[PDB]
Amino acid sequence: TSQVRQNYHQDSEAAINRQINLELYASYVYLSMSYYFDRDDVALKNFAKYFLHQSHEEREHAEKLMKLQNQRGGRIFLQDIQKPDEDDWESGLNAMEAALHLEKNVNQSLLELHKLAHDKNDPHLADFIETHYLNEQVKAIKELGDHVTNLRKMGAPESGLAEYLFDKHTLGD
Amino acid sequence: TSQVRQNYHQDSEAAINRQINLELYASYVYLSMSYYFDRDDVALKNFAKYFLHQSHEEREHAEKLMKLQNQRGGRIFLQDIQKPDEDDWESGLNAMEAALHLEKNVNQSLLELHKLAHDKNDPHLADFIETHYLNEQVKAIKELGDHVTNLRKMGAPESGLAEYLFDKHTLGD
Amino acid sequence: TSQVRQNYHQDSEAAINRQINLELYASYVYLSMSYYFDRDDVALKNFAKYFLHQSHEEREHAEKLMKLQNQRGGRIFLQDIQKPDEDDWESGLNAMEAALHLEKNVNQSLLELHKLAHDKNDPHLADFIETHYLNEQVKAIKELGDHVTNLRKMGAPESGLAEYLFDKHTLGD
Amino acid sequence: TSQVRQNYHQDSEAAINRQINLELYASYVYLSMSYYFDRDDVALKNFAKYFLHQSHEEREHAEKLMKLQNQRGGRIFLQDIQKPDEDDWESGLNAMEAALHLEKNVNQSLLELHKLAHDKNDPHLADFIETHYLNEQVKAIKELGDHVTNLRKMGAPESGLAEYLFDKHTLGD
Amino acid sequence: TSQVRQNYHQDSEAAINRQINLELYASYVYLSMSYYFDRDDVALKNFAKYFLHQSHEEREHAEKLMKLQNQRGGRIFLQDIQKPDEDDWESGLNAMEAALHLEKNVNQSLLELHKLAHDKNDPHLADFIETHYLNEQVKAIKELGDHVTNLRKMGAPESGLAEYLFDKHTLGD
Amino acid sequence: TSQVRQNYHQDSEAAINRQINLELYASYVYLSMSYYFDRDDVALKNFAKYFLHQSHEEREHAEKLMKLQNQRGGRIFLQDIQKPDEDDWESGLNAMEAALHLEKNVNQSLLELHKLAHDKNDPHLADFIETHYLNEQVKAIKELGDHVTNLRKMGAPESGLAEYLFDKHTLGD
Ligand SMILES: O=C(NO)c1ccc(C(=O)NO)o1
Ligand SMILES: O=C(NO)c1ccc(C(=O)NO)o1
Ligand code: NA
Ligand code: NA
Ligand code: NI
Ligand code: NI
Ligand code: NI
Ligand code: NI
Ligand code: NI
Ligand code: NI
Ligand code: NI
Ligand code: NI
Ligand code: NI
Ligand code: NI
């Protein structure tokens, strides 16, 4: 047992490891989308920029959780990172909807983690999730919903004009 | 009777109180529209910016009238602020038309106030309305008419592409 | 149902709407006090400055809650804003005590909202209230209590000298 | 009863007084260690710098809690500050281990305080502890554990060379 | 015996330890007064500022004496810090008089220490007391006497107006 | 077939996908090492800094290869990222040797890729490997060998003093 461990339950430790793996997987998925939009037959540079930035943000999430694990006295256990469900994301609207679904899944995982933290009477971990993850997920979900709504009202994915003008006027700024 | 009151008729005082309430109500309506366009299923950030700024301008109108009341020797009497007629404003063109109607109503109220001020031989209040309210209402009505015309000629509200491009190229600047 | 709604209970949504209305009402009350102290027979400019700033802060509270509602997937429903209980606030000490009472009421409302949020297992809303509202209310209540104590120990409201010197040396800075 | 007290239970008030006394005692202990390393037969200036800074930080903790007490409507009751358990701290590694033990004790006290705050349904005090004390204690415990590990792997306390080089390369920066 | 000890008598060493404890106790008393004036039913922020600064100055006195002890070859022995005689200091004038009494007591202790230092033929310690403590105590006593005189001539503690205006015009600068 | 594909053989495309996966795996391994040295029972912050930077460099390698794939007309196919062989890297010298082995493996993979590129008469891909990967691998291998040699000559891993002083004087700059 580590000399710094105090009030850190092992169920919380396992949940932290699983959430690390999940954030890494989300980073992988965003990387996949980003370079999907870099293909010459898709060619939407601002979509690719957006999803690359999101991938780096998810990697930051993962590293934050690893530092948290080492901080409380837990021990990091890394698992394989699964391949994303798709290799062809069809369109920008489809990738936006997939991202919204992914963020909702990660958000439910974080919410159940917060429940487990409040149950094991771990206020430090509870507030860590409250402060560094929950509102960021809320903002990401609201933003992805805004993007999906805008792309839908413009005639996507039938109108490629819509996706071009959206790549220019919304993501290119 | 207040020691500063001079040539201030009580009909003018009641009209000032009513106009205060009306400007507050207009601010409330603009707030409603602003946060209607912030919803994830509408998602037009520049429409929301525009109507939030208009709400703050109407609140400035109200406070200006309150200071005018205290200046002439009148006495402020606040009333309830009515809820806006709608909670769902359908579209950006519809909200623009509603705003145009609201500003025309407020303008007629201010014009009848100026008539009552010239009747009671109150040149100070007459010029106060002339200087701080009339031309601002004229400019607001002309601008809302311009916006309605542009949105109409672009295919709104059927074309959501039109409202997106208008939010970007007209209100986002 | 909105595409972004997740773990947002409808009781929480109704509580958010009610708290929006309450913050708007508090803003209205502070506006009333502010322009009460602008009257020529009261004439305490720094009291008026103080209460006008407090009114703007309460309006900021309201808009923050509206953005929170749109963020979680709720739907804003605006109600009438009630007229303040009084039109003549008697004295600066009396207005300070009324403000203290109002802030205590708003604080109890926010506390019951936090209880409802922790009950419905909504940690995001719980931490939102924790972070953006609770400590601000605590600070406001402590400050209003300090002001009431100082005004009392100076001989208010009998001594108008006390209220003048307090307007100058405490609120005018 | 103070005019600002709201939802502040008296058990919480007593816990706040006890935690004030505990933070003051920790400051006293760190002061003792700091000036132990200033003796000519110990003579480790950076160890002394480190523990003096830690003493000042603990005094800041205490004053923060006193301001919190006055804020919620509680009443400060000061007790004697106990003399530290030791006057001779043997070595730098021994003082580091003593500091780690002390911080773990203070952390358990703060955790039980947070439990009592969530029990009495005091979300403001709960978030105050969450925000201003918990993560700081976690960081302090992790840092003291790092220092103890490094000193151990270097041959302390047998190797005085180890403590000298640690004072130079780790604490002197 | 320490390798640096020269002409340092053990009676002087015990006196230095006792004076360390006394300066720490004075710091504790000033802290008590400072946060007494922060209560909502007292609410004199500049009195609190003044006494907090005085507490920090007394802590500086204590640390200076500890460094002096380690310098001459003595050995620090810390004792408990006694709780201040009071928890409620009644008024600003009463706290000023208590501070004057406390500083006179500390001054007599320092004077007897200087006598013991000149007796044991310790000119270094004699000049240390002469240079770093005596005139500072004289200045503090004169300043506290000035404050007590001013508060008395203004009608304190009956006139709370007096204490308010004194907090503003004398301590708030 | 993509409209930009010219002289790009499909064996080269498969090799590019495999090398992408390998660079991602190397990034994962370096991340594992980095946060291994962040544990409280290891506690070598500069080792962790070094391996975190190396992980980010390997991720840059991977993204460079993905952009190259999209450039030539190939199609990215992502695979699972395998878990590193170890979770406990024993010591800094052991982690350095593991990193040297990993970089030698990646270098052999890149060399066989260059052979396949010169065989399929693809000078662009050959020079891409020549310019952006080969010399970087040579430098990394030489640097890791230097680090291993230095750690060995200092008495690692038996002497923890050696690893501490190496973390300070070589990696902390
Ligand atoms: O919020 C709680 N702990 O922090 C909690 C969950 C369930 C109960 C309970 O058992 N009520 O009867 O309490
Ligand atoms: O000032 C003195 N020493 O520095 C001193 C004190 C008493 C005497 C004495 O014994 N006079 O007869 O001298
Ligand atoms: Na005119
Ligand atoms: Na919190
Ligand atoms: Ni994430
Ligand atoms: Ni609970
Ligand atoms: Ni354009
Ligand atoms: Ni208007
Ligand atoms: Ni509020
Ligand atoms: Ni004055
Ligand atoms: Ni502390
Ligand atoms: Ni060195
Ligand atoms: Ni002193
Ligand atoms: Ni590489």
UniProtKB/Swiss-Prot annotation, chains A, B, C, D, E, F:
Record EC number: 1.16.3.1
Gene Ontology terms for molecular function: ferric iron binding; ferrous iron binding; ferroxidase activity; identical protein binding; iron ion binding; iron ion sequestering activity
Sites where the protein binds Fe cation 1: 23, 58, 61
Gene Ontology cellular-component terms listed: autolysosome; autophagosome; cytoplasm; cytosol; extracellular exosome; extracellular region; ferritin complex; ficolin-1-rich granule lumen
Classification via InterPro entries: Ferritin (IPR001519), Ferritin-like (IPR012347), Ferritin-like_diiron (IPR009040), Ferritin-like_SF (IPR009078), Ferritin_CS (IPR014034), Ferritin_DPS_dom (IPR008331)
Binding-site list for Fe cation 2: 58, 103, 137
Effect of residue 103 to A: No effect on iron binding but the oxidation rate is severely reduced
One of the GO biological process terms: negative regulation of ferroptosis
EC class: oxidoreductase
Subcellular location: Cytoplasm; Lysosome; Cytoplasmic vesicle, Autophagosome
Residue span, Ferritin-like diiron domain: 6-155
SUPFAM superfamilies: Ferritin-like (SSF47240)
Keywords, alphabetical: Acetylation, Cytoplasm, Cytoplasmic vesicle, Iron, Iron storage, Lysosome, Metal-binding, Neurodegeneration, Oxidoreductase, Phosphoprotein
Subunit structure: Oligomer of 24 subunits. There are two types of subunits: L (light) chain and H (heavy) chain. The major chain can be light or heavy, depending on the species and tissue type. In the human liver, the heavy chain is predominant. The functional molecule forms a roughly spherical shell with a diameter of 12 nm and contains a central cavity into which the insoluble mineral iron core is deposited. Interacts with NCOA4; NCOA4 promotes targeting of the iron-binding ferritin complex to autolysosomes following starvation or iron depletion.
Disease: Hemochromatosis 5: A disorder of iron metabolism characterized by iron overload. Excess iron is deposited in a variety of organs leading to their failure, and resulting in serious illnesses including cirrhosis, hepatomas, diabetes, cardiomyopathy, arthritis, and hypogonadotropic hypogonadism. Severe effects of the disease usually do not appear until after decades of progressive iron loading.
Similarity field: Belongs to the ferritin family.
Job description of the protein: Stores iron in a soluble, non-toxic, readily available form. Important for iron homeostasis. Has ferroxidase activity. Iron is taken up in the ferrous form and deposited as ferric hydroxides after oxidation. Also plays a role in delivery of iron to cells. Mediates iron uptake in capsule cells of the developing kidney. Delivery to lysosomes is mediated by the cargo receptor NCOA4 for autophagic degradation and release of iron.
Protein name in UniProt: Ferritin heavy chain
Species this chain originates from: Homo sapiens (Human)
